[PDB]
Amino acid sequence: SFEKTPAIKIVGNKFFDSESGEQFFIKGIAYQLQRSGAFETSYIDALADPKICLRDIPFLKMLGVNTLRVYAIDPTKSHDICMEALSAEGMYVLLDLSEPDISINRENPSWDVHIFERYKSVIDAMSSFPNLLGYFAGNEVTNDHTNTFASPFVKAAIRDAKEYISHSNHRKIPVGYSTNDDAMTRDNLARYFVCGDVKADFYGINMYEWCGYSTYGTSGYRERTKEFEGYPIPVFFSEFGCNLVRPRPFTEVSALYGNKMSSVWSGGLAYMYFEEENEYGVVKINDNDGVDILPDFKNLKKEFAKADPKGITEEEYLTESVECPHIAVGVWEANEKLPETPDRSKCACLDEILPCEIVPGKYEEYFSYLCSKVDCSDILANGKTGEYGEFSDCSVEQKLSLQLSKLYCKIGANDRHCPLNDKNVYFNLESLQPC
């Protein structure tokens, strides 16, 4: 049963409960364990472990939240026990598709079969749950004026995740983006993610401008609210909770759900549940695996309890592409033109037919070496100029194998000797069998 969590849908720039027709406001907290790793994943998936999630849900209920943000799940594990238990308390999940070792690399961005496969894996693991509120296609990928060229890759990922869901049998869970709050980039980022032919479904900002006993006017919240007025998709704080002043009073919550902000914003999620030596938690897990409540907890609880946002109904609400920011060197360098959808079968053909292959700092050395001997244009991807090589969507190993093979063919010995000395290099006997 998921009767306490009917699926949430989007209409215009608001979220609505698909049964009641009432506007849905997010009252959230981030929920993610870390470690500080071959046989285990780098990330920990608390939603795959009933002993963890079932400990914490009663405390989450006490806080009064209706949403969690989860940054990483292991798609190979089951999640129904934890998802059902969250549903029984009226709780929804916002979920990042990426994970620390499979994300769009903001300093060398690609949108490729390896990252797309991760995204699909997550979608297929999690889309059966009606309380899955939405997916994030990226978190703070572009984060300042020196890496704006990563943003076309994120937009391609939004497009392709949405299309994969569209063509699947799943409920059409919306796909959005979570951004940081860098002054030089924020307006251009927000416009970029709703410009042209591909749009985010919703937009989360990780918002830390309000610290201590601040006010609507002095925090920056009034000016942010003014700038997002009329933005065409739902907008919310995907993180909040500046810890400059402790214990956090969380008085920003009174502003966020007040009349002035509730007409623009769809709520927000505090960062975060667990205390991890970063002074950001509201509970600390002791050496006996019990929950010890920290001084922030009561303050967040009290603020969420008093929050009573006045929205509008789906029926009363119901009664031209936006231009992409222009390019200026050192300010904004995200091309409107996006990379193509990664093509697993084209790329899988390299695995089959190439004479010389490599099994997955060697990449830098090897690309530098091979790309002085053959033309690597076919694997380059440039988000500034909107020029994406024919094989730029393949995995890094496939890309290196392609270049190695070109060098092998260029030499022309035909003696099965691949021209790079490394234990990971091998001649592919399938290349001999008569893509």
Ligand SMILES: OC[C@H]1O[C@@H](O[C@@H]2[C@@H](O)[C@H](O[C@@H]3[C@@H](O)[C@H](n4cc(COCc5ccccn5)nn4)O[C@H](CO)[C@H]3O)O[C@H](CO)[C@H]2O)[C@H](O)[C@@H](O)[C@@H]1O
């Ligand atoms: O694409 C891009 C990149 O993404 C990087 O991975 C992301 C990774 O950096 C991010 O980390 C989260 C992290 O961003 C988030 N978080 C929140 C905070 C609090 O911030 C306070 C604060 C105060 C003031 C101003 C700004 N913030 N600190 N961390 O905490 C989560 C819970 O621990 C983490 O999961 O999780 C994302 C979703 O899984 C990952 O995609 C990736 O490692 C890269 O190579 C890749 O360039």
